[PDB]
Amino acid sequence: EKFAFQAEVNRMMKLIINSLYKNKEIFLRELISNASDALDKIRLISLTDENALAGNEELTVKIKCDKEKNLLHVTDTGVGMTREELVKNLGTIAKGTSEFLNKMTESTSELIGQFGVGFYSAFLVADKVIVTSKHNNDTQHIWESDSNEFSVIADPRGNTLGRGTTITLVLKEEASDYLELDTIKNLVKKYSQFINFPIYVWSSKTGKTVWDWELMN
Numbered sequence: 258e259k260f261a262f263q264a265e266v267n268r269m270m271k272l273i274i275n276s277l278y279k280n281k282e283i284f285l286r287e288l289i290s291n292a293s294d295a296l297d298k299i300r301l302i303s304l305t306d307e308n309a310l311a312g313n314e315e316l317t318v319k320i321k322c323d324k325e326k327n328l329l330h331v332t333d334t335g336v337g338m339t340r341e342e343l344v345k346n347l348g349t350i351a352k353g354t355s356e357f358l359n360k361m362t363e364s365t366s367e368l369i370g371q372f373g374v375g376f377y378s379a380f381l382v383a384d385k386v387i388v389t390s391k392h393n394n395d396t397q398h399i400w401e402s403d404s405n406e407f408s409v410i411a412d413p414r415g416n417t418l419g420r421g422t423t424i425t426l427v428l429k430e431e432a433s434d435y436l437e438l439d440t441i442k443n444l445v446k447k448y449s450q451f452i453n454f455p456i457y458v459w460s461s462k463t464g465k466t467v468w469d470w471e472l473m474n
């Protein structure tokens with residue numbers, strides 16, 4: 258169940274980390290951007306497959322802070338990933354990666370977005386990254402990484418997502434402020450403005466305090 262990262266992924270994790278030390282908040286943009294692209298894919302699939310959205314009818318992005326356990330959750334109802342795609346897409350890279358070797362070493366915020374490798378910016382703010390995904394062609398699995406290795410396991414809780422992906426970030430000590438509602442709300446509203454899917458933040462209202470999904474875009 259344990260795996261090592263491909264060498265090129267190790268180098269890129271260091272490149273992204275070292276070049277975006279100033280602008281850590283971009284991690285939320287990339288996670289939102291990846292969520293939208295996953296929703297696009299299942300929408301395309303639903304054009305030809307009448308059953309594509311049977312595991313989960315809504316097409317949303319839902320973001321949730323868990324302050325007490327130091328966790329941030331980004332859940333989309335996109336196409337999801339099979340066990341094989343978790344291992345392959347997250348631990349290996351392809352194809353033009355090797356031109357992208359020189360391009361990044363030689364601003365770099367736009368580059369990671371173009372080449373679709375923004376996922377690894379999560380390690381700017383997280384000591385551990387956990388990816389829970391459920392694809393129509395497979396059972397729910399869990400991918401977990403501290404960047405030194407990764408493991409993929411079948412999810413003993415079964416199919417809780419229906420369809421899609423949860424990115425769970427165990428936030429670093431100095432990234433504690435990505436646990437505060439107002440920070441997440443303002444970042445989400447900033448980076449979600451042009452996402453063509455609804456994006457919600459689990460938020461508070463006011464004499465008692467009530468929690469519910471608040472639409473941000």
Ligand SMILES: COC(=O)c1c(O)cc(O)c(Cl)c1CCc1cccnc1Cc1ccccc1
Binds near residue numbers: 347
């Ligand atoms: C299927 O996508 C997800 O489940 C998903 C998701 O639903 C949310 C996310 O934050 C991420 Cl990172 C993913 C995995 C994306 C990824 C990360 C690293 C390398 N390749 C890929 C391939 C890809 C797939 C769909 C959309 C965009 C990219």
